[PDB]
Design a protein around this ligand. Structure first.
Ligand SMILES: OC[C@H]1O[C@@H](O[C@H]2[C@H](O)[C@@H](O)[C@H](O)O[C@@H]2CO)[C@H](O)[C@@H](O)[C@H]1O
Ligand SMILES: [Ca+2]
Ligand SMILES: [Cl-]
Length: 219
C-alpha cells in the first residue's frame, strides 16, 4: 500500500543462473602486532575507496546460507585466517579479521507480498535493492558502483541492527547489492528476511538468489 515498492527485472529462464557474484578486497590494518584503519567510515569508501588496496578473490553462484557470526577470535589488531561459509564457493582462507566484500546479483521472491529484511553488522553492511537503487537490469558489472541512497546502513557499535520492508512481485528479479567490511577482530554479516505472513526470520536464501546475463538492454 504505502510500503516501498522497488523496480525489478524480467528474463527468460535460459538467461538466468543460480546465485550471486562476490568480489573480495584487501582492507589492511594501519599497523599489526587505533591499530585499525578508520577509512571504512569515509563517505567515499563505499563508492570508490573500497577498491584502493586491490582485490584478492572472487566467486560466483553464491547461494543459500550466506550469513556468519565469528566471535570466537581471541586477539584483536591482528590478521586472522579463516574460511567463508560453503555458500560462497571460495576455498581459500581469507583475512577474516580485516577485509571488504561486495556481493551482487538478483533476489527473486517466491511469492508476491511484503518482505521484511533484517541486517546485523560487525563492522559495516550496506544494503541496496532495486533497479533504481542497486544497479541496472542486465548491466550489473558496469553499473555496480552507481547505487543510490542506502536502503539500510548498519555500522558497529552504534547502528549495528537495521530493518526495512519492500513489497515484491513473484515474477520479478530484483537487483541486490550487499557491501560488507571488517576493520578488525570479530566479524558479523547477518542478512535475513521474513517472507509475507511469516513470523520467524530465515537466514537461508536458497531458491531466492539469481544472476541474469549482462545483455544490457534492460534484458
Ligand atoms: O567487540 C567487537 C569489536 O571489537 C573491536 O576490537 C576490540 C575488542 O572488542 C576488544 O576486546 C579488544 O581487546 O580490543 C579490540 C581492538 O582491536 C573491533 O575493532 C570492532 O571491529 C568490533 O569487532
Ligand atoms: Ca570487527
Ligand atoms: Cl528500485
Amino acid at each position: 500500500a504505502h510500503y516501498p515498492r522497488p523496480e525489478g527485472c524480467s528474463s527468460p529462464p535460459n538467461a538466468v543462473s543460480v546465485g550471486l557474484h562476490m568480489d573480495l578486497y584487501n582492507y589492511p590494518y594501519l599497523y599489526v602486532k587505533q591499530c585499525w584503519n578508520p577509512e571504512y567510515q569515509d563517505p567515499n569508501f563505499p563508492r570508490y575507496g573500497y577498491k584502493k588496496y586491490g582485490s584478492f578473490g572472487s566467486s560466483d553462484h553464491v547461494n543459500g546460507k550466506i550469513s556468519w557470526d565469528h566471535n570466537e577470535f581471541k586477539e584483536g589488531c591482528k590478521p586472522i585466517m579463516a574460511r567463508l561459509p560453503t555458500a560462497y564457493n571460495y576455498p581459500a582462507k581469507i583475512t577474516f579479521s580485516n577485509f571488504t566484500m561486495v556481493l551482487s546479483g538478483y533476489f527473486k521472491p517466491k511469492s508476491t507480498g511484503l518482505y521484511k529484511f533484517e541486517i546485523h553488522a560487525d563492522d559495516f553492511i550496506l544494503f541496496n535493492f532495486g533497479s533504481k537503487n542497486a544497479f541496472e537490469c542486465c548491466n550489473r558489472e558496469e553499473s555496480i558502483d552507481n547505487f543510490g541512497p542506502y536502503v539500510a546502513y548498519a555500522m558497529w557499535p552504534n547502528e549495528a541492527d537495521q530493518e526495512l520492508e519492500v513489497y515484491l512481485f513473484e515474477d520479478s528479479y530484483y537487483p541486490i547489492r550487499l557491501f560488507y567490511n571488517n576493520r578488525d577482530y570479530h566479524s558479523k554479516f547477518m542478512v535475513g528476511f521474513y517472507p509475507p505472513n511469516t513470523e520467524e526470520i530465515t537466514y537461508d536464501f536458497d531458491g531466492y538468489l539469481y544472476m541474469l546475463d549482462d545483455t544490457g538492454n534492460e534484458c
